Write a protein that binds this DNA or RNA. Sequence first.
RNA 1: UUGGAACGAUACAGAGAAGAUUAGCAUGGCCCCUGCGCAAGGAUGACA
Length: 49
Amino acid sequence: DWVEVGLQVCRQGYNMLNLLIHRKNLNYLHLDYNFNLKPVKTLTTKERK
RNA sequence: UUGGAACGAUACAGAGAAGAUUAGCAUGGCCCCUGCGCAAGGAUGACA
């Protein structure tokens, strides 16, 4: 069903973007399920860079 | 007891300013001046 494929692709794209986010083993950027990227805390300027 | 992280965390410190800084004397250069030495050289005074 097309809805099932859409859900699968949304989950797979979330997984791929999550893999890209934790590329350099940095865990202070969180990607929600609505695909909004936000820091998990008040990140320092070096970590922001 | 044994693992995450280790380009991190914390601790200390944080003037992340700006610099070869600055006073005296002697040397050295130049022009005199003064004294002495050295090598010569000028002009001049003096009777029986």
